[PDB]
Amino acid sequence: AQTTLMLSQKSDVNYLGWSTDESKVARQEVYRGTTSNPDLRERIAVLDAETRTFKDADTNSGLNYWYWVDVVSENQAQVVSNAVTTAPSECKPGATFENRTVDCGGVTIGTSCPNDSDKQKPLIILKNATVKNLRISASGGADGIHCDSGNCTIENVIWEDICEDAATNNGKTMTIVGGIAHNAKDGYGGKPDKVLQHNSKNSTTVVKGNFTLTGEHGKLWRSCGDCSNNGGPRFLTVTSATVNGTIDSIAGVNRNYGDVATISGLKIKNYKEGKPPVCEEFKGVVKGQGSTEKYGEKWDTTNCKVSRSGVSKL
């Protein structure tokens, strides 16, 4: 088995994101040191087997740090990641991956993110494919990653500043496994909007592995509200995610099209009921054939399958 680790620094917090192919994970341990010597690293956290992200806010400004993540199997196997530090090739813009998994090895890719653009291109297109360990540059997020057919997995991807959006589901099932997505007010792409855009129908967007949002965001997922040839049903399944920053709302479902958002394991910084609203119901429309409407935040309804127990203060 193997584990690949990536690091992203945000607001004096070091965020770690990793992917692992170990199938029987029991626990995961985070190690840190002030030097590159792995023999001197010391454990700073013991985590459950499901998360794929971690945040370290206990560092001093005058030091550099090295991190490693040890994925421990039920049978004592130590699957240790590469080291990452704060100390100062198939994955290229426009690439399409089909029916296979591509490990980007932690490289960075990006093009641009022009102000006021009406159309931007995807950096990576997946067709029943998986991409893992990739960083999207702050100034070149363009239209993120597209799942254009079948089942796609976006595993341990870091968006330094989401441009139009982070990922788009134009396929059957798009799964986000871990990853860290940053957005900011006045950042690239304008006012923060959605992270995950969902256009296909009879399809699902899945969020797990403690996908983490940092900075300021519009919403985590939106079933297209006014797409050409709009309709549904569109589904969202959230089992583990964290918002360590601010967000306007979490999910937007078009209840008239049968959309259903099923949410639990959601942690939000300083969460208060209604701040932010989690699942909101809307009326979706076909472009040019009517106006959308917002009905409001809902709990335990047909289309908003989220209970108060599904969301908590981080």
- The footprint of Ca ion (CB under 5 A) covers 161-162, 183, 187-189
Quote the least distance from Cβ 146 to Zn ion, whole Å. 4
Which region among 72-80, 92-100, 139-147, 223-231 touches Zn ion (by CB under 5 A)? Answer: 139-147
Q: Is 58 annotated as a binding residue?
A: no
Determine if 148 is a binding residue for Zn ion (CB under 5 A): yes
Q: Is 183 annotated as a binding residue?
A: yes
Per-residue binding string, Zn ion, 182-201, x by CB under 5 A, is ---------------x----
Determine if 146 is a binding residue for Zn ion (CB under 5 A): yes
Quote the least distance from Cβ 291 to Ca ion, whole Å. 27
With CB atoms as reference, the residue minimizing the distance to Zn ion is 146
Determine if 164 is a binding residue for Zn ion (CB under 5 A): yes
Partner in contact with 110, chosen from Ca ion, Zn ion, none, beta carbon below 5 to 8 Å by kind: none
146 or 234, CB closer to Zn ion?
A: 146
Determine if 127 is a binding residue for Zn ion (CB under 5 A): no
Determine if 165 is a binding residue for Zn ion (CB under 5 A): yes
- Three-class DSSP labels, the chain: CCEEEEEEEECCEEEEEEEECCCCEEEEEEEEECCCCHHHCEEEEEECCCCCEEEECCCCCCCCCEEEEEEEECCCCEEECCCEECCCCCCCCCEEEECCEEEEEEEEECCCCCCCCCCCCCCEEEECCEEEEEEECCCCCCCCEEEEECEEEEEEEEECCCCCCCEEECCCEEEEECCEEEECCCCCCCCCCEEEEECCCCEEEEEECCEEEEEEEEEEEEECCCCCCCCCCEEEEECCEEEEEEEEEEEEEEHHHCCEEEECCEEECCCECCECCCEEEEECCECCECCCEEEEECCCCCCEEECHHHEEEC
183 or 230, CB closer to Ca ion?
A: 183
Which region among 41-49, 69-77, 158-166, 219-227 touches Zn ion (by CB under 5 A)? Answer: 158-166
Q: Which positions lie near Zn ion, rule CB under 5 A? A: 143, 146, 148, 164-165, 168, 197
Binding-site residue positions: 143, 146, 148, 161-162, 164-165, 183, 188
